[PDB]
Amino acid sequence: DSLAPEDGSHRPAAEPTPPGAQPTAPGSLKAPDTRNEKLNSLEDVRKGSENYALTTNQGVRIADDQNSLRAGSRGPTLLEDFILREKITHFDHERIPERIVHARGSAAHGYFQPYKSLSDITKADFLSDPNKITPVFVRFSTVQGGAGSADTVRDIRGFATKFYTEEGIFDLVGHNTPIFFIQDAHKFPDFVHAVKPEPHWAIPQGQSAHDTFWDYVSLQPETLHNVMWAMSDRGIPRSYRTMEGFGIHTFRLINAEGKATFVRFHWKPLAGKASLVWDEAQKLTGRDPDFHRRELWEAIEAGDFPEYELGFQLIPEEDEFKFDFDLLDPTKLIPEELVPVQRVGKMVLNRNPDNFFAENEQAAFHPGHIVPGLDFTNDPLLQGRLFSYTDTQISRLGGPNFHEIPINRPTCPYHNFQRDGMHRMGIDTNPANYEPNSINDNWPRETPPGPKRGGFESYQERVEGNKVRERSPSFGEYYSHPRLFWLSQTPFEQRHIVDGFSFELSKVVRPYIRERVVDQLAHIDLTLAQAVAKNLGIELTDDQLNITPPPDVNGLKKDPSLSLYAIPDGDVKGRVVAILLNDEVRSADLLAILKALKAKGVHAKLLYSRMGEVTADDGTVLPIAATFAGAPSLTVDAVIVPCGNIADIADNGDANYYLMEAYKHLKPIALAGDARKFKATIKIADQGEEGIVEADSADGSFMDELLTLMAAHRVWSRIPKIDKIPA
Template identity: 60%
Template sequence: MPNDEASAKREQVEPSRDHGDDGPLTTASGTPVDDTDNSLRAGERGPTLLEDFHFREKVTHFDHERIPERVVHARGAGAYGRFRPYESLAEHTKADFLQDPERETPVFVRFSTVAGSRGSADTVRDVRGFATKFYTREGNYDLVGNNFPVFFIQDAVKFPDFVHAVKPEPHHEMPQAASAHDTFWDFCSLQPESMHMVMWLMSDRAIPRSYRMMQGFGVHTFRLVNAAGRGTFVKFHWRPTLGAHSLVWDEAQAIAGKDPDFNRRDLWESIEQGDFPEYELCLQLVPEQDEFAFDFDLLDATKLIPEETVPLLPVGRMILDRNPDNFFAETEQVAFHTAHVVPGIDFTNDPLLQGRNFSYLDTQLIRLGGPNFQQIPVNRPVATVTTTQRDGYGQQRVDVGRTSYTPNSLAGGRPALASPGEGAYAHHQERVDGAKIRKRSDSFADHHSQATLFWNSMAVWEKDHIVAAYRFELGKVTFAEVRERTVDQLNHIDHTLATRVAEGIGVPPPKEPALANHGRTSPALSLANSPTGSIATRRVAILAADGVDAAHVEALRDALAGGGAIPEVLAARDGEVRSAEGPSGTEPVTVDRAMSTMASVLYDAVCVPGGVESVRALGDDGLARHYVAEAFKHGKAIAALGEGVQLLRALALPGVRLAPEGAGEAEDGEGGSGEGGPGEGVVDERGVVTGAEGAEVSTVITAFADAIACHRHWGRDTDRTAA
């Protein structure tokens, strides 16, 4: 259970919460209202009167309800939670919230896309924001990160150019929330420093399955400072307990139409159901004396530190356990700022970080109406705030007294200055000298080697997805010279990559590599190495029709829910379907969703239980057949029990062996191959699990659960699958 400190933020906000359920409807000034359906008129058909103060107030407020959306990260979702360190980090930092494993710190986290507007879809190909506000006893600390460890540019002065390039093109305001257009690729093809980040963007990392299954990174190199003043360079990482998993591109596009709120809904519903998202905070620590020990510059935000070079140190756990009460008041008005730091956490000279330290404060002044945005409940520190800042738009404080300056004698010198020993922030002392110059260090000049490292580290299926993504994006580019320049950049990363992309977009493939591939890998970069083994929170569609085997449905529901999954029965209609005659009786089976309202792309797995009549009806239903075929195409786990195998047999899924109709060896699908099944009479062929006649239902379901836990099954022959 959360301790008192973890609940401090909720208690602080409580006086601002208004349930609106006591007393009559009133105006904003508190006057009760007897009619809010009709404006005040001169006669029933006469003109509306200017003296109708309720009408004027109501409409005026409505006219001003919208505020400017964020220039980037406009589309987002948030949640409250708590953070607890595993042990004291006093050796490295004096930050108070990282000292006591018995103390929890309240947090607010906002996840977001970057390029799209507030109303854009969740599952677009994009970077995801992962911003965390720690409400510590020393003030708010904001870790404003992304789900990629690097960025497109090295210097913040290029940020307006990058954002202008990726946003909808100004002459027609298209495309929305997409990088697949001329201006983005024109910019990147001329900006080699973007190549590493673009590799991440073209990978499956850019289409996460869920915010709960997404890593987070602080991007920059920061500095920890301990009580003795010793500094240590640090990279921040968030690792999801459920592992990092992604969608596939065809699936992501379909979800954007079927449920544009997919990731937002997933986060909200998981918390409401008690399936609280969890993340482990990990650090990469580099002693200051090792600053130049790498073949890249620690200050370069387009570079990462390979985990094999500097392993991650797990230091704490964050749990998100409460949804906001009001989206606008909290998720929309929350303001993050990279310069919101606490004693023990400091900056480096990263030129992108230095620019963010200006921009994040500046942008709130217009968006939230002035300098008092820190007084908005979600932004308010739980630490005591004593400043000489006064007045301004939206001022909520009633500061008592005559003095608003320091030094003063009239108030006894209060508020007094604190020393570092009393908790004051002290900037880390380092020698800085040099001539004023607009020039980057030569150590920032390598733009391709880490992009090559990323490519080399991918599994075969990840490389296939990256190539397909480049072909899709560049296929939307109308200027041949932009395509050609991009292929040339890719040829500096890997010749095979450049050749495969070129062949798909009508560009002559390069004849030889521009740079030799160095051959290095970092297994930690591949999603293929992300932890699996759990079916917790996975959504499973159980397809049913009249005549379904109720015992199969019950066994599926019990076993899958017991493992933490969310099984749902889908049928052609809401309500109930008739169960098959048999030992299970004739009790109807409750339908959770109508198949027409929930596409297969919204589920992690699909199962077809037995029942002759049910399977026959599903076989005659094009939507049901499409459900299974689409799940197969997207690499999802599929199972069939009893007569349900007949539906899979009718679909003739290419390259898939199915359990036989009677006793005997498993049937080979066209081109089928592979190992035997996980149990007697059970066949698991690349995540397609079927049971022969007489096979134990529990054995089939266990194998199905194991297949779901693998997330996706690659290597299927999907090119011939119509879905």
């Protein structure tokens, strides 16, 4: 029709812009100059729209897209209307099955680059030269919930990276904790079914807090280590940018001379580590179920690119048997105090997709997708994974040509004798469809193994044993890793752990399950169990009080890299602040505030009790971003309240509640001049307290005190005051 506004405000600028400033858009329209080899090769499937006629899928122009063909304008719809039937038919078949686990996920494009050559330890081409740039596609996700479930639930997180290398696709499919719940792949459907919604009524969504999950845990102690990680704050991250990444299993690195080294993969966040606190996370699933997906997308649009460092834990083959635990057991970690992480390269995420369904929903990752330079090991969880990812993709993606969907295709060449199958795209001209053949002179040909561009050959490991269905005796210890984890947390992190267990077990209906869990906790640590017991109204038996604790792990009694906050690594860039306005804000306060924030790279959200504009005291006009109710304190990292006509909002229930909720969730609060009246709303002493920044006006140290607290992420010293406070 020609319906866009003349002034053209229906379309966002194609340049970096702060969260909420402009409408978000497909990646190639927001950042058309952000390119890589993978992005460039997708140009053959991209479709525009501007200046084109509206057509059927066969290319016939459509004259009327508002009506069906009928006999009379009030008559029956005719069967001969092929335009209507095509339109509704495509609509009716839009959906494909979601992923059996990790259905909910958010993705982006980027690139990886090695810091130096690793030709000494591996012959993988993508790690061989500091100038080789490798394009990546990454998907972050939850585990339990469906694709329409919420982002900030309590759960393990997935971290999958598809490396488009020159010698093949390499998929590193990891998680956000260094261990998994079970030892053998044979139990995966059992563990998955226990955590997922119960089979009679399909409840509950996105939660482990129900009878069957805890039943399975109390009968299978191997799950205790990863259960400790999920009940800690590791289970509710602040953002996909601020969590750690792990491969979990021990793999092999193979060099040109044929030597094998054992490796555990690590992803280290450059924005540091941060998480939410339970009541904020749970509330946040209602006020904004898409908070992580939204933050990821907006961070890239604003230029705050997620950056991670790839790291390796390296173990010589001769050291296979030197630890207290088995290296092939995925319920056990390798303490950084024993085997340091070597920082090897970096990944940067700098462009969003164009179409979620086509790039994200259809992407397929699989741990079996490795390259020459790498190899597997006998970890029994990894072993059964190799079977599963190829099999499941046959029904999810509809056939064996899933590698022909544009986001999954390699950028390097691929030729073989495989043919046909549903949805076949490639037209092969090879006269032969088998080898050995003389009709095409045996092409394509096998290629011997070598130091570069050679064929894949498996490491020749020795196997000796009988065919048995049995667990290795070295896999039989379940309590010392959990205890190592428990003793490395800070005191306030231990408290959050206790509260996660108490909360979750309180939702378990059958009381005997709660009691058996508590018993299992008494084998890990007594203080932990006494504390969980008292919140559930349980008494420990005298026998439970004398259980002997498990041993140290190779002499360690703590490892600080297991805590989120022991060794702080905060980075305030990309964090966001809430500024609550009034109808006559002191513009001198506002300019000192906004300029300090921009200097550190922190975003501001200007809030008010209605939408539209507000006029500052010097006549300056401020556009309002959202209302107090529309952008709750759950969404910001800290609150600033500037001087001005404070009586405008001193009596508004939402403005006050905004300060009580943030105060409760331990975020820093700043009050300028008469905005100090608000201290009475949160029971702050006249004297003041750590975490509340207050001054006569918003000037000098005001902003610097505020930004120091933001780098410390939350105000842990206030824990003691929040139990009162009705928020």
